[PDB]
Every structure is written in structure tokens, then in C-alpha cells.
Structure 1
Amino acid sequence: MTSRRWFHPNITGVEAENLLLTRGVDGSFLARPSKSNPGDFTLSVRRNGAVTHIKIQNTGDYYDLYGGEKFATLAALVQYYMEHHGQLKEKNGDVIELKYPLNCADPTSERWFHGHLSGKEAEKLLTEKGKHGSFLVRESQSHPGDFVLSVRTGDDKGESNDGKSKVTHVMIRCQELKYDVGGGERFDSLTDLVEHYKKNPMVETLGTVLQLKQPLNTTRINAAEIESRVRELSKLAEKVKQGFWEEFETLQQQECKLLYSRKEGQRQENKNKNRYKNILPFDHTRVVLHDGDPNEPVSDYINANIIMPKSYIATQGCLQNTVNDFWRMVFQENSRVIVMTTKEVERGKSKCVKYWPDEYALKEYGVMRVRNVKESAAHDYTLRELKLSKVGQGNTERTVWQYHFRTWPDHGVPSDPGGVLDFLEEVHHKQESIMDAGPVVVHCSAGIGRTGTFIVIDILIDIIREKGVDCDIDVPKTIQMVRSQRSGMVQTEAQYRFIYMAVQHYIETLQRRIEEEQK
């Protein structure tokens, strides 16, 4: 039960209207990218004979539901309003019920789908970029409107030598919407067909089994060849599409495989310790404070997750009652660099309180004591030299360098990654200059959007700055890997496209630098 089938990637506002009136009943719902606004998201629900279109906005921080609450993943929004029946109201006071997710048949958001592809090209990818169990679903060439499942069965590992590895093509005839292997069960979508034979593998005479283990891998590219990959993901034709949009929606369709328990944040005692009540840290990667023996009640909770591929800490904008716990986290984790990707107040709404003292001032935050030594005022950011110590104790003073990015737009992402790339280059060198410094504390508003976008860009650069330009990078796998440690890292497609532009702009400077060193 993942299932995210209730999300239709390529759907009109009128098609969703008809889809609920004919194939749905009262309570049936679906989520769709809003036509009206490229950042908006509409939740269409059949409500008393008619359809109600509730919209969800996402600027790069969270999914904000109108007349509802904010969430990290569009799936946890559905998980919330399906297990909480009386919270989605029209107000008027009439409740809107999410009871029956209406599934979709479009396979374009699946990793194993390939769109246009041919047998030789499909077989070439299965032996070059393949492995035992690798499978793909392409468009049929000869018989139109059908599909061809191409699965590789190998030597076990399947590399070196030849003769005992094999690629088996399978015909998938499509007739009156349904799909089949020319016999047996007829499925409603390629997913229902693929998911079925991933659990009931096809077997032919002489007893060979076509294990649909893992899909292929169009994603992992060499870091030097990114300027040609960004060129492919930029051509637009939506039979599809914007390459960034088709790739990102595939990454979104894998998000409910990361519905890990965040119950330590759902406790009543930690209710007001979260800036946003439904955006919570994973229990298995949360930062656990160690106040010690109470000192009632000590408490160990903070909305922060450890990010480890140099490690990171992705936290929230400090609340009034969490400034004390924040500086406890910086002390125990031995953190020395803080990345703040939000202004003190943006668009009139406060997203983070001032947790640092004014310049040349000393302030006590409970057990911790912070001195603001200096404030450097570059453009795009501000560096604050801070000394963190423990009140009533010696040999606890450490210098914490807070980097406060100030020029991130209120709506969307910047237009030039040079500011972020230069900002991260100074942040990385300051971090590496301190021996055995703790993880890098990155935060913003909710701590998933800009906070996740900054970290993923830094993770890809750390790989490139070390291993060089001839190394393999994989952005969706990098996004997904961080999303398994904090729910909803990298929010919007705009932030996702910016991560490609940042790595691209970073490779050019490296190549230009190397060439200039050769005059």
C-alpha cells in the first residue's frame, strides 16, 4: 500500500471532473498538478454528486492546503486526511471526506517505463547499463499501441564471459484499455501488470524465471557529461515532455516508499516544539538531546534529522521555546557551521526567530551561552563568528560560524546558481578547516525545501571536488537517499531543476579553471 496511484501526472481540470463523475462515487478523490499555476496542486474530490477542487500551493517550503494543514510530502497529506476524517472541512462547517483514492493508468511516472524505445536499443541498454533482474517496458514498434517487457536474466552478476546471460522480450498486448501477456489476467495498467509479475514471476518451458527485480538506470551519468544531460531534460514537448518534469514526477512517485514513523514528534509533550505540526522528523534519524538526569523534564526532542551520505543536520527554523534546545543540539553534536537559508521574516510571515545575539553581545540560552564576536557583511550572505559555551562550566567554548544566506527569492529559486555555489564553497572550506567538526546545521522555514536543496547541491559538489570530474553522479538517487532521512527533502521541481543548474555551472568553472592553469 504505497500507492500514489491517486496522482494523475498528465490530466486536465475537466478530465478530473469527468473521471470522478463516471468512474467514482462520493468520497473518491485524486491529486493533480494544477493547470492554472505551475506551482499549485489541486485535490479534486467528488462531494455530493459534484466535484470540489481544493488547491494546494508549494513555493519551495511545504505543501499548503487551503482550509487545511501543511505537509512535507503530498502522500502524507493523503495519509493524514484519510486517517483523520473530521479535519478537512469547507467551513461552512461541511466536511469533505477522503475515502476512495481513484487510481491512474498512466505509467510515465514509473522507473521501468521508457516511452519510445526499440528492441535493439532496449537490448543494448539491458546489456550495457544492465544486470540480472533489470527490466524495462518500452513502446512496441511493430504492433502499435502495445508494449514490450524486456527483462535480462544473467550469469548471476552477468558480467564477464558470455552465453549464460539472456535478454527475454515479452509482448504486452493492449486491447480495450486492459493489458495482458496474450493470455491469463487482464490488468488495468502497466503498473498492475508489472507489480503482479514482480510477485508472480513469469516462467517458460524449460523452467526459466523472468525476475523483475529492479528497473534500469537512465539516471546515473558521468559528472563531465552533465551539460549534455541537462540539454536533454530541457527540450519540451507536452508526446512528452519537459525532461526535468518527467524525471522529477518519477522521483515523486517513489515518495510513499519513505513513509517512516515520526511518532516521537506526534507526542503531546512535543506538540508546540514543531513549527509545522504535521512536518516531523524521522524517529530513526532524529537528533536526540542528552540533558541528563532531570532537571525536569530534561527532554530529548528537536525537529532535526541527521543527514549522512561530511554529514549534515537538517532542522527547522527556531521557535521561541526551542532556541534553548537548538543550542543544546549545536553543542552536543560538536557542530561548528550553521547554514541559514531564510531571512528573519519573509513575505510578512515569520519563518525563524533570532537565536543569535546582536554584534559584540553575550546571551545565555539556558545552559548554553553564545557570544557574537563579528558579523561579516558580504552580498548574498552574512557570516557571524559565534562562541558557544556552557554556563557555569569551563573548557566548553567553541567557535561556531553561522552562515546566513539572505538573497533567496521569496517565490521560487534564484536565477543564477553562482551565488549558492560561491556561498557553499566558503561554507565547505570553513567546515574542512576545523578538525573533526560536527555535522553542518542547515535550516530554513520547515527545513525540507531550501534546506534539502542546499544539502543535495553540497553532496554532489563534495563528490565532484574530491573524485574529480570523471565520476558518476545520480541526482534522483541522491534526492531519494536524503528523503529517506528527512521527510520531503527538496520540495518543488524548481528546486530540483536548480540542483541540475548548480552542478552544471559548477563543472564549467572547474573546466575553465583547469584550462586557465594551462594558459
Structure 2
Amino acid sequence: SRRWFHPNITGVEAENLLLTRGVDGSFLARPSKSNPGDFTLSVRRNGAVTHIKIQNTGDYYDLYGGEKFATLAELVQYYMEGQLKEKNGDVIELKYPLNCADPTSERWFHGHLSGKEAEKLLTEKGKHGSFLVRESQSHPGDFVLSVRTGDDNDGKSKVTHVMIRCQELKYDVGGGERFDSLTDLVEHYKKNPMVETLGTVLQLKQPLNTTRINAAEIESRVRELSKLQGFWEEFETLQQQECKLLYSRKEGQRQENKNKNRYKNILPFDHTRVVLHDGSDYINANIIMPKKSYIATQGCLQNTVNDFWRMVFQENSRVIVMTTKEVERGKSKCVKYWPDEYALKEYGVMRVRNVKESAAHDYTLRELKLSKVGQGNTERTVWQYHFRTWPDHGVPSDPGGVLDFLEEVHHKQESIMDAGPVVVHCSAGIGRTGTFIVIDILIDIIREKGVDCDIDVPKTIQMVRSQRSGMVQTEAQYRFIYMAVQHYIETLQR
């Protein structure tokens, strides 16, 4: 599962791997190291290696010659389970994933860690089933499998250390099968746990949590992740978990809804999709939640504007968040679904009325009045916040611009009690849309609790990714999330 992604590798090493231990059809995904949002799909074909470029400017994974996908896993699953081909007839086959042996992108692997900290973190934050793998203390090359077992200083639990000999580029626990990587060793003993001779089972339930910190400790944790980087290693470890999020998207793949998606492969999950009553029922949108919830949808197509306002009306949405311009990178991202100032336009049975626009520095607020065409139908105020400062590529260099944009959107949601979920959307609705939702979630936690409780950015992103595919796209957006939370704390401290 996502073993085909080699995080620490250059192009010269990928050509040697596919030509040495790979056959025709063998493929791997490698990240362009110092080029942001540039990935390469290296496939062996006709004895040579073909490198297909994948660009991610912060909105989607753009595969040259293919389509646009939410994650690399959905990119791989789509061609191993459509088809990819060059501009000149010849087809490219994705057949055999060339597995990676680098464990630095795994949650349980720490490395250069001692039994002092291993037993310490497993005794404080630990829980029955928690485990970790660290570089060996006395045998340079080996590793130690520390497992906590039992209950929830009563002599209840314990920490059993399991030596993992590393010999001949294979990993063994000192008896039996010898695996090609530490991941293969942990995955084998996750299914079939070890049993000590006296009847205790070394079950590897969940990895040890090390990404949760106090919301006042945010300035230090960023300083540790800033340079040796920890930001990159903590993000790639999050990326290695997206293969667990390949859930069914059948409703988005139906022939009745092929044209209702701006990108035919970036589709909503079935278990969280937004269904539309009255009238079809489809719209590329998902329901996000941690109370206050969200709706994350794509940029409206010209044949989905009527469905967009049926969603806002039926779900009783009073706040809309637009995080992209009308046209960016020379291509259309979101059609104009809102009337101009001091005007009214009718979208199907709905009616939107622009009362007054307020042009701020970083965004534009529009006071809209939504109502269905009917006799006793009264309007209700829907506020559209249009963030215009966000650059075409990457993230803004100042979190304060996005910080002021969120707390103002937040206060508009409190002004209405019967309000529903906030509608956040960009181009595909996964990149900036995901970054805005996660930051607001982590901040809504902070403003309610203060600065004396816990926050977990990696767990929050994975929790949101399980509701819509590929939320928070690039590592720049991941780092910007920490900066926005760090910046919100800084204003509360003063």
C-alpha cells in the first residue's frame, strides 16, 4: 500500500532501480526534491525508463498526458484498476509497483532514538498496543521493536523490547522469515502478532503518537520542525497514509454525473457526499466535520450552478467561502455563480440578490439574499467571502491575511443560529479548500479551550482526508497550517 512511493530518491537512483530489479511495467513515484509540487512517475517500458511528470501547484495532481487526481494513490489506482498513453499512440502500462524500503516515511519508525526516550514516551503517552521502531543502541544497523502491552504503575502494563537484526539488507526479528524492509516486518507482525513462550501477545495495534502537543508549545515544535527538514519528514509520513483512504466514489462515476465534475477523477466519497432532494441529486461536494461543520465542493461548472444553490438552500448554508479567483493559471477555475452588486439573478428555482459588496484588503464580502421562487417564500441572508489575495501557486507568506479572513467568516457563522455548514470551495475543492478548513478547525479548537490543551495537525488532516479525497495537497500548505496556528496563538498571547 503506497510502497511504490520512494520519498528520498533522485532520478538517477530510480532509473537504476527499475533497470536492476524491475521488469517492463514496473513503476514508482518519486518526488522532485527541491522543486515544490513536482512529482515524477517513473515507468520501465521497452527496456528504457519513462519519466512522466506530475505537477501539483496546490490544487490537484496534474499528470502530463493523463488526468488530474486528488492523491497519488488515486492516480495509481485509476491506471491499475482508465489507461495512460503518450500523445503518439503508444500506451504506457502501470503494472508492478517497485516497493520502497525507506522507513522514514512511516509513523512507527523514529531512528537515532534511545531506550531512554522509547520507554519514556511509551510510559507517558503509551497505551496497550502502542509500538515504535528505533535505531539499535548497541548494534549499529539493527533496530528495536518496543511494544507496550496491558490494561490502560500498578504493575499492569509493560514495555517489551524485541531486537530486530539487520543483516544482508534484510530485516529479521532474530528467528524465522527475513523481510525486504522494516515495513514488511511490521506489517507481517501486525497481522500475525508475536507470542512469548508464557502466553503474552505482542500486538502492534497503533503507532506511538508524537505529533500531539500543547497549543502553547506551538512555537517550539515549529522551531524543531523548521530545519532538520522535520516539516518534510512529518508531511511525507502523513502522505504514506493516504492509501488507507481509497473509498468508493461510485455516484460521481455514473454516466448521469460525468459532466457535473470539473475534474472527472477528483470525485466525492459516497459516505460523505451531499445529496440534493427535490428537482437528479448529485453535486461534487462532501460534508466535513470535527457544533460547526463544513461543505467542501469544487468550482461551479456552468451546468452545476443551479445545483450549487439548491445545496446552499436545502442545507441552510449562510456563509460561503471562495478561496480562488475566477480564472487562474490561464484556465477557468470557477464560473460566476453570483449576481453583480445591486442586482438579482435567478438560478433555476432559486433567487440570489446582491445587496452590497465590501472590498477589503485581502477579500471581498458580498451580502446575498437567497430565496426559492414561491409565494410565501422569504429571503435569508447568505454571506459570500471571496479571498483574492491567495497566490496562483503556493501559499501566502503571511498567515495574518488568512487569519483575519477566518475569524471574520467565523463571526458571521455565529450571527445565525439556524445556520448550516460553511461552504468552502476553490478550483477542485481539495487544495486551498482543505487548507482553509483544517486551519479553522485547529483554531476553533484553540479559541474555545484557550492555550492549555492539545492539538494534532497530522491527525486532523487525515481525519478530514477521510471525508473528502486529498484535503491539504502540498507540503507548503501543510507548513502554512502550522504557521497559521502559530500566528493565531501569538495574537492571543498579546
TM-score bracket for the superposition, by shorter chain length: over 0.9
Q: Corresponding residue for 2:185?
A: 193
CA distance in 2, matches of 1:320, 1:264: 20
CA distance in 2, matches of 1:20, 1:154: 44
Q: Corresponding residue for 1:182?
A: 174
1:104-119 alignment runs, 5 A limit: 104-119=100-115
**Does the 8 Å CA contact 1:315/1:447 hold for their aligned counterparts?**
yes
303-312 or 341-350: which moved more? Answer: 341-350
- 3-state secondary structure, aligned to 2:259: helix
Q: Corresponding residue for 2:205?
A: 213
Is 1:30 paired with 2:28?
A: yes
- 3-state secondary structure, aligned to 1:274: coil
CA distance in 2, matches of 1:252, 1:436: 37
Q: Measure how far apart 1:165 and its partner are.
A: 1.3
CA distance in 2, matches of 1:359, 1:341: 19
CA distance in 2, matches of 1:63, 1:351: 15
CA distance in 2, matches of 1:348, 1:163: 65
- 3-state secondary structure, aligned to 1:489: coil
Alpha carbons of structure 1 residues 393 and 289: separation in structure 2 relative to 1, 3 Å: farther
CA distance in 2, matches of 1:25, 1:307: 42
CA distance in 1, matches of 2:334, 2:36: 27
Q: Measure how far apart 1:115 and its partner are.
A: 1.2
CA distance in 2, matches of 1:164, 1:269: 58
Q: Measure how far apart 1:163 and its partner are.
A: 1.3
Is 1:163 paired with 2:161?
A: no
Pick one of 199, 221, 234 that aligns with 2:226: 234
**Does the 8 Å CA contact 1:42/1:53 hold for their aligned counterparts?**
yes
**Does the 8 Å CA contact 1:376/1:382 hold for their aligned counterparts?**
yes
CA distance in 1, matches of 2:407, 2:443: 9
- 3-state secondary structure, aligned to 1:224: coil
CA distance in 2, matches of 1:349, 1:91: 21
- 3-state secondary structure, aligned to 2:141: coil
- 3-state secondary structure, aligned to 2:195: strand
The number of aligned residues is 493
CA distance in 2, matches of 1:366, 1:431: 26
CA distance in 2, matches of 1:38, 1:371: 41
Q: Measure how far apart 1:263 and its partner are.
A: 0.5
Is 1:145 paired with 2:152?
A: no
Q: Measure how far apart 1:141 and its partner are.
A: 1.2
- 3-state secondary structure, aligned to 1:375: strand
Partner deviation per Cα, 1:223-255 (whole Å, 9 max, x = no partner)? 00010000011113xxxxx11110010111000
TM-score (norm 1): 0.94
- 3-state secondary structure, aligned to 1:269: helix
Partner deviation per Cα, 1:368-422 (whole Å, 9 max, x = no partner)? 0110000001011000000001113323411000000001001100000000000
Aligned-residue Cα RMSD (Å) equals 1.2
- 3-state secondary structure, aligned to 1:273: coil
CA distance in 1, matches of 2:22, 2:209: 36
CA distance in 2, matches of 1:35, 1:364: 49
**Does the 8 Å CA contact 1:318/1:353 hold for their aligned counterparts?**
yes
**Does the 8 Å CA contact 1:13/1:35 hold for their aligned counterparts?**
no
Q: Measure how far apart 1:12 and its partner are.
A: 1.0
Partner deviation per Cα, 1:77-102 (whole Å, 9 max, x = no partner)? 0001112xx63111211011001011
Q: Measure how far apart 1:470 and its partner are.
A: 0.7
- 3-state secondary structure, aligned to 2:87: coil
Partner deviation per Cα, 1:48-87 (whole Å, 9 max, x = no partner)? 001001110001000000011000010000001112xx63
Partner deviation per Cα, 1:172-210 (whole Å, 9 max, x = no partner)? 000011011111110111111001111111111211111
428-437 or 329-338: which moved more? Answer: 428-437
CA distance in 1, matches of 2:277, 2:173: 58
CA distance in 1, matches of 2:370, 2:200: 64
Alpha carbons of structure 1 residues 279 and 393: separation in structure 2 relative to 1, 3 Å: farther
**Does the 8 Å CA contact 1:61/1:449 hold for their aligned counterparts?**
yes
- 3-state secondary structure, aligned to 2:108: coil
TM-score (norm 2): 0.98
**Does the 8 Å CA contact 1:333/1:438 hold for their aligned counterparts?**
yes
CA distance in 2, matches of 1:385, 1:285: 29
**Does the 8 Å CA contact 1:413/1:494 hold for their aligned counterparts?**
yes
Identity of aligned residues (%): 100
Partner deviation per Cα, 1:248-299 (whole Å, 9 max, x = no partner)? 101110001111101000000101000000000011111100115xxxxxx1
**Does the 8 Å CA contact 1:138/1:148 hold for their aligned counterparts?**
yes
Partner deviation per Cα, 1:103-131 (whole Å, 9 max, x = no partner)? 01111111111111111211011001101
- 3-state secondary structure, aligned to 2:160: strand
- 3-state secondary structure, aligned to 2:334: coil
CA distance in 1, matches of 2:375, 2:385: 27
Q: Corresponding residue for 2:245?
A: 258
Runs of 4+ in structure 1 over 6 Å off: none
Partner deviation per Cα, 1:319-344 (whole Å, 9 max, x = no partner)? 00000000000000000000000111
Q: Measure how far apart 1:38 and its partner are.
A: 2.6
87-96 or 440-449: which moved more? Answer: 87-96
CA distance in 1, matches of 2:334, 2:16: 43
**Does the 8 Å CA contact 1:373/1:384 hold for their aligned counterparts?**
yes
Q: Measure how far apart 1:155 and its partner are.
A: 2.8
**Does the 8 Å CA contact 1:384/1:401 hold for their aligned counterparts?**
yes
**Does the 8 Å CA contact 1:62/1:71 hold for their aligned counterparts?**
yes
- 3-state secondary structure, aligned to 2:102: coil
Q: Measure how far apart 1:433 and its partner are.
A: 1.1
319-328 or 387-396: which moved more? Answer: 387-396
Q: Measure how far apart 1:36 and its partner are.
A: 6.1
Is 1:349 paired with 2:331?
A: yes
Q: Corresponding residue for 1:154?
A: 150
Q: Measure how far apart 1:35 and its partner are.
A: 3.6
Partner deviation per Cα, 1:150-187 (whole Å, 9 max, x = no partner)? 0011234xxxx421311000100000110111111101
Contiguous gaps of at least 5 residues in structure 1: 237-241, 293-298, 511-517
- 3-state secondary structure, aligned to 1:251: helix
Is 1:133 paired with 2:129?
A: yes
Q: Measure how far apart 1:436 and its partner are.
A: 2.2
